[PDB]
Amino acid sequence: VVIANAHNEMIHDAVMDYYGKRMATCSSDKTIKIFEVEGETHKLIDTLTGHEGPVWRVDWAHPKFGTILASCSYDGKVMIWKEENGRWSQIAVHAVHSASVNSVQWAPHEYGPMLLVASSDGKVSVVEFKENGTTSPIIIDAHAIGVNSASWAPATESRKFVTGGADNLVKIWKYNSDAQTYVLESTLEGHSDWVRDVAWSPTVLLRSYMASVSQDRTCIIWTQDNEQGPWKKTLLKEEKFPDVLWRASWSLSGNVLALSGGDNKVTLWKENLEGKWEPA
């Protein structure tokens, strides 16, 4: 179902609506594109523009609040646009960070219309969209050099999300009505280089599963069982993948690992009966 040459500039992200019927591509050309996919067809609708620097990542909001797609660019700003009347418009612009923003994912509709922003400005922001338009932002420093990922943890307070460091550190953050904002929990060390990406699973089974990919060219699957329980570092393999590792994605169900390399190859992984990993 290829959509050959969607952009002019190299593409940095390919995400779909909750109903895999409409896509969203973003590139360096500072532009994002909306799509329609059927059997093998690709209808190109609008092309989102207002981004000064290369767009990095984008994320589809839950249909619960209509059609909304958020994008983050080098321009140190993340922007969201809705699709009222089949015509794409820019609803709000979030630019609190001072430097590139490399990741932006939406919170489980349960939580609400929340967006988690992680900038290379070393900080991270949490923003929910009220009514009138003016939101109440929440920012908290998260890493030394910077921040590269900010995946969320499923619903359960009890609001958690993992961060990937520019300083090689993976962290866990849980809300706190007494602290007024998300505070640190874990600080799982493991990578020798920078944490390129970290995604948290929705697999509600007995134990929690977290993925961490990095310039150190390895994935460390962080498995923990309960509050007490510490996270068990686990090398996806006791060798190095020839190139870096940029993305890690969790399948809806069946909990399978989508590990987008850098050697330009995508690999899939599963945890056999023991607790190790194998292809698919």
Author numbering: 2 to 157, 169 to 292
Give me lines lifted from the publication on this model.
Sar1 recruits heterodimers of Sec23 and Sec24 to the membrane, thereby forming the inner layer of the COPII coat.
To understand the architecture of the Sec13/31 outer coat we applied reference free, contrast-transfer function (CTF) corrected, subtomogram averaging to solve the 3D structure of the vertex, and of the connecting rods to resolutions of ∼40 Å (and ‘Materials and methods’). The connecting rods are consistent in shape and size with Sec13/31 heterotetramers, and are bent in the middle by approximately 15°. This same bend is seen in the solved X-ray crystal structure, which can be fitted into the densities as a rigid body. In contrast, there is a 45° bend in the rods of in vitro-assembled protein cages. When we analysed the distribution of vertices and rods on the tubular membranes we found that they assembled regions of rhomboidal lattice.
